[PDB]
Amino acid sequence: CPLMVKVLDAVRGSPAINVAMHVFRKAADDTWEPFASGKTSESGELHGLTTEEEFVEGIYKVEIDTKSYWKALGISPFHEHAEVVFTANDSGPRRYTIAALLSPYSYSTTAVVTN
Amino acid sequence: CPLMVKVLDAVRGSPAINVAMHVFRKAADDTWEPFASGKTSESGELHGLTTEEEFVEGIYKVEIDTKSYWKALGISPFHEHAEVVFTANDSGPRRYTIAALLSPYSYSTTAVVTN
Amino acid sequence: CPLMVKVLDAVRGSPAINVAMHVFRKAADDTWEPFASGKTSESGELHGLTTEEEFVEGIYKVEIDTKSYWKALGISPFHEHAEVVFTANDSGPRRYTIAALLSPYSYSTTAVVTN
Amino acid sequence: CPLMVKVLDAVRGSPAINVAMHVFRKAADDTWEPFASGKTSESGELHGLTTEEEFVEGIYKVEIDTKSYWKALGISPFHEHAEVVFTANDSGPRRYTIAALLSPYSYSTTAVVTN
Ligand SMILES: COc1cc(/C=C/c2ccc(O)cc2)cc(OC)c1
Ligand SMILES: COc1cc(/C=C/c2ccc(O)cc2)cc(OC)c1
Ligand SMILES: COc1cc(/C=C/c2ccc(O)cc2)cc(OC)c1
Ligand SMILES: COc1cc(/C=C/c2ccc(O)cc2)cc(OC)c1
Ligand code: NA
Ligand code: NA
User: Which of D9, D12, D78 lies closest to C13 in CB terms?
Assistant: First the structure.
């Protein structure tokens, strides 16, 4: 698993299930190229986004649709989405876990990077 | 003001107002002695807990009554309180700001220490 | 002051000083137009980005240059920047405070919205 | 796994390995009774703290020795320890995951509670 995203709900104390996200990779003209996509499972996790061979050096953006998640719970949130922008694989392959902890007016994100 | 506490509400996007907290200092017999207490203002801040003369070296604990805060909003939260335990003034007097960001199943705390 | 940003450093226990950030507003053609920019003060705060007249309804993005901040401290951080994307003034003028807490592999952001 | 604790390092982007913690349960005289103990594995996780039969209604405190963790990295941290105090099993058994994200001057904690 070169890239996995885990999403937690800080209000309900649960995984954040069915959270949609897209992953983009910055192109040479500084535009965002589509790269991967999916939605979180019942464990709050999204696996299988990419393969080691396809996941090369670049600047990547994970755009998580947190607004739709809160709206489904009848809560008006602050953010349009949560974005996580990072350089990956600049020293060769690594495995990346992106974790996001969600509240209506706040989010916290961290990365675990393993060789 | 050598010690100030600021509390924010991540559900409502507001200062956390009227939040009670108690400060303790570890005594020579290793018990927690009462040191100061108060409630946050309309800005989510609690000033005036102590003075430079009274705020000697020691181990201090701030216990923020997050449970009563959430219960008054009709929410059953996870934590009994949010606690911050730290050594203060080890190397001479410092000014401490403790900030806490609250959600029903999560809290995040940080300190700003200035000379 | 309808928009203020405060940045804290979780490694050093200090305001994050001299942190650059750029604010964008989504244009009618869905592109990000420059709106305002500045750097945090010695208190970690950036005031004066905009005015009530200029800060109309819209989707805004604050991009905080966390990478340059960590690199100047000799740290190679994970994120390219910390981003906050939000709809503002949907239901009339509001005052927004965005707070960001920074670590090399993590950031946490919250908003306080007042009428 | 009725009770699991997961600890992450926000500075290095890694699990926090070999982090010691003790779990206490509040007794009738309001003192803290020893309940469980251990240290995190190479994945940053501590499993096997208790069994369903032993883990009954009570107020529990997880005291995580974050200070020793930072000192091993030559970093002087703010907190003496990170504490997580919560009522558990008041509506019968649940499974609890306590997550803590550590920085030298900050920690963030959340709970995942599953029936
Ligand atoms: C403390 O647990 C909470 C659960 C919830 C659950 C809200 C919710 C809304 C719609 C649903 O379909 C399910 C849960 C909200 C809370 O603060 C707003 C706290
Ligand atoms: C809104 O003004 C403030 C925000 C904050 C935000 C603190 C904070 C704590 C934990 C987090 O995860 C994010 C922000 C701190 C302050 O100390 C003076 C003032
Ligand atoms: C960006 O990754 C970092 C790694 C580290 C690693 C520190 C360290 C110290 C002692 C050790 O034995 C291993 C790592 C520190 C950082 O900011 C202080 C950032
Ligand atoms: C419950 O299992 C996990 C919890 C967490 C908690 C992450 C987190 C992120 C931000 C915070 O402010 C607090 C915890 C992370 C994980 O990484 C795979 C797994
Ligand atoms: Na001393
Ligand atoms: Na409107």
Answer: D78
